[PDB]
């Protein structure tokens, strides 16, 4: 239920020449600034997650 | 700083002792996938933040 949502990623908004998908904050990791939460995103949540 | 507490000096000690390359003998040990010390530290590069 929490797969792909265990992050505090937030959208940068427009004006920064990147897609409006939410991105991990912080810095100095490699994960920082990467897309999150999306079914199109590496490491994000799958579309319509399977349910019991 | 030169005038440091004992607690800070002890932290300097552990960091200095940890700051070594991997022993060359443990490489040959069976089923071992440690080729290098991935927790290496240089004073210029990464600060220990204490």
């Amino acid at each position: 239920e929490k797969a792909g949502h265990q992050t505090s990623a937030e959208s940068w908004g427009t004006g920064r020449a990147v897609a409006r998908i939410p991105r991990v904050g912080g810095g100095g990791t490699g994960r920082s600034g990467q897309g999150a939460f999306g079914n199109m995103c590496r490491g994000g949540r799958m579309f319509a997650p399977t349910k019991t | 700083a030169a005038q440091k507490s004992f607690r800070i000096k002890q932290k300097m000690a552990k960091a200095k002792k940890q700051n070594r390359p991997l022993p060359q003998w443990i490489r040959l040990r069976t089923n071992n996938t440690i080729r290098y010390n991935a927790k290496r530290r240089n004073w210029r590069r990464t600060k220990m933040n204490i």
């Binding site: 991105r23 810095g27 490699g30 920082s32 600034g33 | 060359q24 080729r35 290098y36």
Partner: peptide, 28 residues
């Protein structure tokens, strides 16, 4: 034997975010 694991330091993705003058474009 003095192996070389690549540093792979990360760079802040923010980059420069400044525009010309103050506006350069207010009421075209």
């Amino acid at each position: 034997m003095e192996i070389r694991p690549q540093r792979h330091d990360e760079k802040t993705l923010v980059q420069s975010q400044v525009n010309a003058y103050n506006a350069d474009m207010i009421d075209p």
